[PDB]
């Protein structure tokens, strides 16, 4: 039910805890993180743990036994990371771990954390086709992604505090250092358009170009960057110092971190030549649960299945039977309205999902319920969602019996959204369709006309002719119930 | 568990879907509302029903049997009002209505109508001592509460569908009609300064008051009048005609009784000589629903028993053990605080309560919790409280371990809201007590000096340590932990 997963890494610990809702049903429950640094002063000592930051790190595994203990957990798995694997005294730590908390730590190898890095975006990602970089302290992790399946794997010995530790802190040239950057980088045997930025190193940088650009979107998890734009300012970072760094909204942690992950970055991208990259906020700690989820599914969810959308239903509406049907009455009204509207037929996925929540904020309050629809859609539809999706399904629910704005934000967000005669015409179809389906009503059909739209149906359908008038329309069209 | 509660109504036929998630705890699963105006052209006819009203009400009531079908309620209550007990084919409506749906109509009396108004107003408003005014279609019901009980009640037979039929349909001078107004409002034996504003009618004016003052809540339930610096723009609202009221935002389904019914109001509040009416949300719908969950409690929630506030935890977070221990921090912390801020005592409700909720938004996402529990406060947190409780405790939840801009709209909403240094105390309080309690602590104890606090406790509190940096502090204060 309630799973626990600690990723020990090199800079940051982390702590997660899943809640298993449905059979493929999860949302994370609680996060945290701790800059213990265990690897502070190792890579200089051949991979020695220094005192100083493995007692850190017995304290912080301390208290992460007690979060997860406070939340009722029946299962708790930890898994160590470079700074750990390729320790002399991996064993030692791994013993006195258990002496003051009692958690038995499970080493990872190079070329199976790449594993969940890719389990993780093959699954909570809205492309499947990619090449994971999961830019950490001590290693960077790549796997290719093919339509879900892993192809390759490859675990280079380069990190963000690695190559702090002993390159950036004497002040070496810094092409001297993107010489043994590229002795590692260079033995990638796969190339591909897509990236996946993984780790919070990438995060951290995807959260200055939000910053800069004005995204208004406030979720990092699926932002799109274009590799070729950014590619020549992401170089820049590592030039830049401490002052310049917090202009640009770095956090404090992130400081003496970040322009050396910053140059691992523009070489990875420019040897595989990708053209977009996608950040991703899910890593280890999800490929660690999407492997038990999934064991008996082969590492993957089975068509249609979107664990994001599934979890939000069983959290807010567990009894869906007034809502599927509110869905099933929009892709009949679409098709029956091609002509006026002659949309393209991709944007069902998009007004199906919307259908399915768009009564789902009368868990809050019946009053502005589409207000609260589109807030819980904006900010939770995310695993399987880009950002444009997101935006259209969170519109066509806030704006349901109402007209769209010219200057909406989220509207444009982007070039590649729809016009606004679109989104009102889906938000119409879906304002229709609520008013079809409020009544128990049963077994509708509709036919069109040049502007007459004749409903038929065995049912009387009083109360939805009353608020027909409170019904925006794309255009002047006419609505009979016969 | 689900109960339906139908208002057949003079003017507006209402319909409620009640859920009991506890013992005290419910909330609105679902309402709708149809203007078939039963009452149409009866007042000639000595309250003869006409068949085109009549047939209306039939299929109207015939769908709001599926509604509540549709939602799987175990109980369905109707009731109706003066427009059907006036009336001489009283038994005929009551029987044709089983022969198409089957739902059995129980007449109540004008006595017994102002008992449910008064039932839903001493128990779900911020205030147990006022005069209820349900000013409908037909009969304006008023009764007094005196500390959560209610002395009298009356029954007044004018309305705003009743009045307009036999004196605004003819153009009579405005004070021919405040003639009859005033026949029935002088028998009103009492007096109070509180008044509460219930029914469609009343509602529909406090949106054009909350629209021209600019009011930033969006909520109507609890908005506070002053009923001697409005009560002159009141009555003007009669002499504006079609065009001018619809600028000022009335909906189009209640222009032909908002003139009428305006013209009711300013004549009881002048009687009464109120000087603070409350907009209520909650009405004969509600007060069913509260007679039979306090049958065996004396129509009273128990002390210190919200039925919102209860409400909203059994569905985000039926396990509080970890937010009732963020609450009971919070008192300690502020006594251990009082020197330096020398704050109210009463502030320490929306302490309280915050500290319960601070953690709610966790059900929707981890990322950005606070703000989706503020979220969650300002638009659910309904019952018991006025609009400036809400607004505290709103901001107190969002602005965790954050500074409060001087410009925030929600801070400014009235002149009785504390000041930004006494809200950054309490918010300081709660980020402080939020840190505290993270890991299984137990049994911790505080105590000051000048500027220093320190935290007594026999447990590590290694995390609380490391994220007190990112805390921010009302005045310079040093936090030791011995
Ligand atoms: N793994 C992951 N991390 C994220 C994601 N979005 C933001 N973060 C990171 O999560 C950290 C905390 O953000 P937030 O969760 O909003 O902190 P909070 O301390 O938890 N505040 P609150 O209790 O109000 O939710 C930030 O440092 C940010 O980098 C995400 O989608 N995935
Ligand atoms: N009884 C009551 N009525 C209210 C309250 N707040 C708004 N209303 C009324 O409720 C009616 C509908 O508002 P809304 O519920 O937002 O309509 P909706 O049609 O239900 N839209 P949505 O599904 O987005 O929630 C309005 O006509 C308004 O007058 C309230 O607190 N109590
Ligand atoms: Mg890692
Ligand atoms: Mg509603
Ligand atoms: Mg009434
Ligand atoms: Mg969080």
Redesign the interface.
Known sequence: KITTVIDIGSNSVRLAVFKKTSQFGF??????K??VRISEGCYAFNGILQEIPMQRAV??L??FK??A????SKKILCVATSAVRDAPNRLEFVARVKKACGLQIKIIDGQKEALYGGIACANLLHKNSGITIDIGGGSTECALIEKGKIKDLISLDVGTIRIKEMFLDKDLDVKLAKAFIQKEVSKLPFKHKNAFGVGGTIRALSKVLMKRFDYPI??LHGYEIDAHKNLAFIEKIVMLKEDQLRLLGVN?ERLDSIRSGALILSVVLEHLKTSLMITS?VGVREGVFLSDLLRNHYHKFPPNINPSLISLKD?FLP?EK?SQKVKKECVKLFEALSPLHKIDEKYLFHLKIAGELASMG???????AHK?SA??IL??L?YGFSHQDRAIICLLAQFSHKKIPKDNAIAHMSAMMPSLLTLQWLSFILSLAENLC????HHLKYTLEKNKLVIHSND?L??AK?ML?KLVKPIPLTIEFA
């Not at 949302?27 to 945290?32: D, G, K, Q, R, V």
């Not at 203990?69 to 009722?72: N, R």
């Not at 009368?362 to 502005?368: G, M, P, R, T």
């Not at 409020?438 to 009503?441: E, F, G, I, Y």
């Open positions: 949302y994370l429950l609680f996060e945290t701790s800059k304290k912080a301390s208290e007690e979060i203990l406070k939340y009722k406030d979720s404090e906020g959290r009894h007034h009368k868990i809050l309050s019946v009053y502005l609260h807030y819980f900010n939770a995310s409020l009544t128990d009503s009387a009083y109360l009353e008038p």
